[PDB]
Amino acid sequence: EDIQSVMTEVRRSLGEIPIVESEIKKEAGELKPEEEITVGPVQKLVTEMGTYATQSALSSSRPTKKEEDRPPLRGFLLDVAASLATTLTKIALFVAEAMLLMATILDVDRISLCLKVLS
Amino acid sequence: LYTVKAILILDNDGDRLFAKYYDDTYPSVKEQKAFEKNIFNKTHRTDSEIALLEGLTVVYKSSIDLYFYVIGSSYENELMLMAVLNCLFDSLSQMLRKNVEKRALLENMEGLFLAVDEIVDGGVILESDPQQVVHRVAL
């Protein structure tokens, strides 16, 4: 979680170009700790705001490409014990609060606003 | 016919010392310059017998000092269209006893202006021959 928080903070601090999906993949590992240790739907909501932000920006328009998406796995990646976990992820592919946060974040919109202000 | 996007008399330094967008629907002084730039930079004092840009008629001319632009649509025949463009050089020349120059331009704008409104007014060319004008005007 320390690492996660740090990542978020640095991300916020930057914004001015890059490219990584690959990175996303890199942090994640085959498995890994996320959230308390599980917060299910809320946890699905958790994935939804942090990832969505990355995405929101993603959804927005471009200059020079940064990298054309090939995040097919990206989709599983977001959603006996191991088998159960996999199933849960597939289904996906506190919770309410997370969802709300993601919606608020939804970052092309932010960029657009900034442009307007400049104008 | 409410057909002038703009008529501009442009310097050939890409400058514009006249523009009237008779009709317009795109903006920005910048974009106007930009738009200008692509084409002007490209035509660079050089013009063409004819030029179509945008499926749109571009009749443009050059003088011996100045660059004339009219933008219109290739959707209205050259001969007439040019005739107005012709009218523009010629009358100014005779009346004044002098056609356009950079110098001329610099001393006073007004006459151009005076003329211009008379000839054309927006996207409709009310007229394209000098004489009428010549009598009509008396400034």
Added chain:
Amino acid sequence: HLEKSAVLQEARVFNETPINPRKCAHILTKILYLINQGEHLGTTEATEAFFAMTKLFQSNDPTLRRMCYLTIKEMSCIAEDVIIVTSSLTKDMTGKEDNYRGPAVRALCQITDSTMLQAVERYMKQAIVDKVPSVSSSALVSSLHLLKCSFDVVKRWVNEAQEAASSDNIMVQYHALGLLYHVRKNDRLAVSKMISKFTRHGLKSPFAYCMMIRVASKQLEEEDGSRDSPLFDFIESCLRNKHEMVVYEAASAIVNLPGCSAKELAPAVSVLQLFCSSPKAALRYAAVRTLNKVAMKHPSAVTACNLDLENLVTDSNRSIATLAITTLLKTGSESSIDRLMKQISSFMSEISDEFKVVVVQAISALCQKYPRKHAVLMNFLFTMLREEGGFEYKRAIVDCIISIIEENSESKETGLSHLCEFIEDCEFTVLATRILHLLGQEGPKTNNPSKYIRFIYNRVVLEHEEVRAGAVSALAKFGAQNEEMLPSILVLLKRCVMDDDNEVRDRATFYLNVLEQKQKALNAGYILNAATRQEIFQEQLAAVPEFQGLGPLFKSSPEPVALTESETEYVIRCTKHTFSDHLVFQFDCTNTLNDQTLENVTVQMEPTEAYEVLSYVPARSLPYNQPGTCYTLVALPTEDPTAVACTFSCVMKFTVKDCDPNTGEIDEEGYEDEYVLEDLEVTVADHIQKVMKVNFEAAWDEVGDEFEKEETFTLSTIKTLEEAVGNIVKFLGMHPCERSDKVPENKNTHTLLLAGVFRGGHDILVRSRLLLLDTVTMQVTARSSEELPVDIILASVG
């Protein structure tokens, strides 16, 4: 330079009476300049400026009268008050400085409003109409901007209004008509009788002609009727005069010949073509591209060579350069000449009026006429393309590649062969991206594995983690499919070729790791990615519940009937549906006029040849241009002689309510009027399934047995079936038979022994023995498995 500031301060100059027209004018000029060049500012200041300016106005200082016009002129769809002048406008109005008067009105009109609109009006009417052509012109222009806003205020005046448009100056005459562009926007009929006015008189302004042309033309597309004489009439008219533009204008549309008109017109055209053929009308270029279309007819084509050869030859005139590409293209070319041209082009293309752009357009056309097809040409071209080059091909490539794909070209082995090689040593990473992506999909459906591999390796060979990367990605669609040797080896290869360089390492590792992670077969999969038609209508109808019987639909309408004729306000098209028990007429529509919405709608039907009439149903509300449903319902009597074919009489009733489409109102009040409702006739084909028999031999006879009615005619003025024939195949909608159908453009004898089944289950059967002795005398039999049909067939067939 420009800046507002000096001027606002400088407004105190207004305070002086000793002024020179020049002195002030200039000052006035300065403000206007900033603006002519461009400025932006506050209203407050503008308002102020007005006042300040306005303030000055004792004189008639003529010059003074103009400047302000400008000034004012600057403001029109983004103004600030109106009233102030007012007096000044009037002052002109009683005041003979004619000149001035006209400019001022003109500005107002973008700025306008309705009350104030009220103002001018009696006079205005005059004014447009008034005196010297000059003044009148001034008047006109003014409306138009107000037309933006509206102009209908004007509009109204119209029966009466147009007539004044009657002209005696050319310039003017031309002008009158555009206003008529919008006038004709409003109306088509009007034109027609009108034209006979336009048609009626020979015209003045070349200019006037032109709008008409477009129009005239516009009209022509589907046909402008029997343009024969008009077209002709016109044809001279366009054709010659002292004003060139018309001839040309006409010319470009008019061809007509794929086995069509070419008569006079080709010669005249030729006179023109040739005449133009060196930039008389540098116009000529455009036309060939489409306006005057070309894709030829075979001898015709041969003739074309010379003209194109002049342009081709000349190589000059922007108008020329373009012309060269279209003419050559349209008319097409021999291989050989191309060759000569390739060299010509070699020099030419770079700048030769800035040939490259025309050429890219030309090129885009090349990719299309041969987009990897005449591959030999494609390759010749390819070699040449790359070669003549500059760089500018790349842009072209974007198109070219696209073309090849469009065909989904098949001399790929070669095509690809050129591409692959050249591109290698024709560079540009960017191209690779695109092509990669495409290639990415294609793989082993087009085999040639070793080569393709051979290539692929190479593509990677280049540095760039990125360049390298594509070969693997393309591969996934490919790998998965495997080819003429691949699966085993496919498995072997990823192993054989492997890489470090960290993130490049990672790419190898990861793909592997990814590979590592799924059963490679699975891996590949995820990653890589009666009770007729009419019965349906019985059901569709079913959602309603006001029924008074239905059944299941048997057959439906052989023809939907527009129950209101063409493009009427309450436009109706109706479709009729038959079930074994009931028939529903469901009514399809577009309550047309935006005038109206019809409300309180129900449908009357009144019948002649039986049906029990249960109900008339109407739609609750019908607004403009939007189907709604109304129905009318009947139950179908089946065993009676005369009981399901019927014509029903229609009257539409509604309470008619007016609309505001902007924002409407829907209120309880509004009053009825009723309009005639078209007839419905019910057929013998809305109900029937046409068939072949369960037992013809037997059935054929049998149907006679129980059922049979007859009619005989002896035919003495005509010895032809055909009339009869028109009524029978077509009315019944059944099959003519017993291999007794066929007749060529003549035939000695004919029987239709014919089939289908009627609604209510039972069948209706017909034998028509048409007999030719040489008169026709004939036996028509209807036999049926239903009683109502035998009487019916004999009638119905008619």
